[PDB]
A paper describes a structure:
Saccharomyces cerevisiae prevents uncontrolled retrotransposition of Ty1 subfamilies using distinct mechanisms: canonical Ty1 is inhibited by a self-encoded restriction factor, p22/p18, whereas Ty1’ is inhibited by an endogenized restriction factor, Drt2. The minimal inhibitory fragment of both restriction factors (p18m and Drt2m) is a conserved C-terminal capsid domain. Although the crystal structures of p18m and Drt2m are similar, three divergent residues found in a conserved hydrophobic interface direct restriction specificity. Structural and genetic analyses of p18m reveal that p18m and Ty1 Gag interact through a hydrophobic region that is shared between both proteins, termed the Dimer-1 interface. These observations suggest a lattice-poisoning model of restriction by p18m in which the CTD binds full-length Gag and forms dead-end intermediates in VLP assembly.
Given that Ty1’ CA and Drt2 also encode p18-like domains and to understand if they had the same Dimer-1 properties as p18m, we expressed Drt2m and the equivalent residues in Ty1’ CA-CTD (Gag coordinates M259-Q351) and determined their crystal structures. We observed p18m higher order aggregation through a weaker Dimer-2 interface that was ameliorated by introduction of a Dimer-2 suppressing mutant (F323S). Therefore, we included F323S in Ty1’ CA-CTD constructs and in Drt2m F323S/Y329S (SS) for crystallographic analyses and F323S/Y326S/Y329S (SSS) for biophysical analyses. Inclusion of serine substitutions reduced the aggregation tendency and improved solubility necessary for structural studies. The asymmetric unit of wildtype and Ty1’ CA-CTD (F323S) crystals both contain two monomers arranged through a single Dimer-1 interface and the Drt2m(SS) crystals contain four Drt2m(SS) monomers arranged as two dimer-pairs through Dimer-1 interfaces. Inspection of the structures reveals all helical domains with arrangements and packing resembling that of Dimer-1 observed in p18m and confirm that the F323S mutation does not alter interactions at the Dimer-1 interface. 3D comparison of the Ty1’ CA-CTD (F323S) and Drt2m(SS) dimers also reveals the strong similarity with RMSD of 0.5 Å over 160 Cα backbone atoms. By contrast, in Drt2m and Ty1’ CA-CTD, it is the V266 sidechain on helix α1 that closely packs against F312 on helix α3 and because of the greater steric bulk of the V and F residues the distance between the V266 and F312 Cα atoms is increased to 6.8 Å. Concurrent with the increased spacing in the VTF interface of Drt2m and Ty1’ CA-CTD, the side chain of the conserved residue R315 can adopt a rotamer that allows it to swing in and hydrogen bond with T270 which is not possible with V270 in p18m. Thus, this “arginine-flip” mechanism provides a further level of discrimination and specificity between AVL and VTF Dimer-1 interfaces.
Numbering used by the authors:
A (entry chain A): 261 to 351
B (entry chain B): 262 to 352
Amino acid sequence: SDTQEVNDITTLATLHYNGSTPADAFEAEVTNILDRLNNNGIPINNKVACQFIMRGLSGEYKSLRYARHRCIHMTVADLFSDIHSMYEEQQ
Amino acid sequence: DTQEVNDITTLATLHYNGSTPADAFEAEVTNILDRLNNNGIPINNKVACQFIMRGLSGEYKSLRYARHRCIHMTVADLFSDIHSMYEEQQP
């Protein structure tokens, strides 16, 4: 509660996703961290968010990381689309 | 282009046990906070204080009991206490 921002930032910096849990749940976790950080006056822009998410991708999802260099132009929604697409074509 | 992610990761993984000068530790953290501020990721006194406390090891772990007042405690005040402990430990 008093440590929500520190916990949210720590989570963001230590994300991991390998497809073994629903992509929706991963998207929710990340989305809400970003929302809460925004509310607490710590705005994480699209580029930085994208980089944290990419860093977290393991297993087959590692492959999405070769777009990390375009994070500036890539939207978080676009990235989540690709993760969702990969999740679907693993199920 | 990954300066923010690197600066946040460092903040979230600080370690200090007195084995290096307190001035160097202060410098590292201060400049992370400065750069994050510049890049539109403003870490306030409370959150900064919490990250610093989390990183204290060895004899310095003991300082982690003012953590609850980080809201009212300043980063400068905490670095004072670390400096004070560092001085005591020196010849």
